[PDB]
Amino acid sequence: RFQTCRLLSGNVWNRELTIIQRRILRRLRNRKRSIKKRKIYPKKYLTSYIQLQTTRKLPFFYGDLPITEMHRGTKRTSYIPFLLNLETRFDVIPLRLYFLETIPQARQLISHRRVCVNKGMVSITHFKLSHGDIISFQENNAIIRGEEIRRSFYKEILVEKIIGKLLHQPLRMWRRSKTEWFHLLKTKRGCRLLLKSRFLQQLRSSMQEEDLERTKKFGSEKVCLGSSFAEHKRMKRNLLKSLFLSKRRISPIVYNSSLSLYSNSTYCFASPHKLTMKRRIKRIELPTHYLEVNYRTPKAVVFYGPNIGHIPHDIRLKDLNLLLWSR
């Protein structure tokens, strides 16, 4: 519920933020979340404040179970029942990690409907399954949720993202009608393939570039440098020694090319991360520590268990370095 986002001073993934909700989130997020989180230094147990915030974020993420109680069930602090319930609780974890809403949409499914595992229905809603478990819908589930997963993987990863990243900054009441139009276009199973083949090539190039940005963040250029340590020195050798050889002892165009390519060497191997970015969209992080689906008809046998650094945390590495004291 949005009220919970208001309490958490931020955004707990309410769906379909109506207009005044847009207003109130901008207000709350910026003003409050800044002012508190920006520059306070309170004795107000900021450690324990953080603790409350994280132990309150996580339960909605996994629906509504109390996770302090999960902590308490064992005598440890954390990270073990975490890696465990995420190894599987079998509806809230896997069905959402692939294709659903972890909430009582993906719940009650195992209650009444079926997702037979190894053709075996396991209708307990909290199972733990690992190391060789075939996850399969029923057929009367398939004949609808094939279409549902298609309209998900496209309307909610192509359409919404594409009306995002663009058409955006001045007016959203306009991305509204643009979503209307692109809905009319996605109504079409030929438009599908044409879009597969459309100018999204350009956007993927720009995305490669922005990943290169977030890469150069922390030394990709430094390792490029070390890996091509000679080559720049070789260019400098060209320049300086052809100088002290040809003259002052084609020269002008030797200097032309040497200057150009050498200065360009130094530029490309020392441009330090002009970020200045407007916003940042988010990727969908598919699990390939678990095995994929026959996305045609759901048959998504697992092959392994999860790690801790590749999980959809809506929390930065901090406060989860306070919960999961991990490297």
Partner: peptide, 30 residues
Amino acid sequence: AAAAAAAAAAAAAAAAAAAAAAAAAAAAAA
């Protein structure tokens, strides 16, 4: 001519240095 190119190397390299220096001076704002 080659002395013009040597001072040209000094010119372009100090130019690049100062440009990236101001670039970082601006990136330190955010």
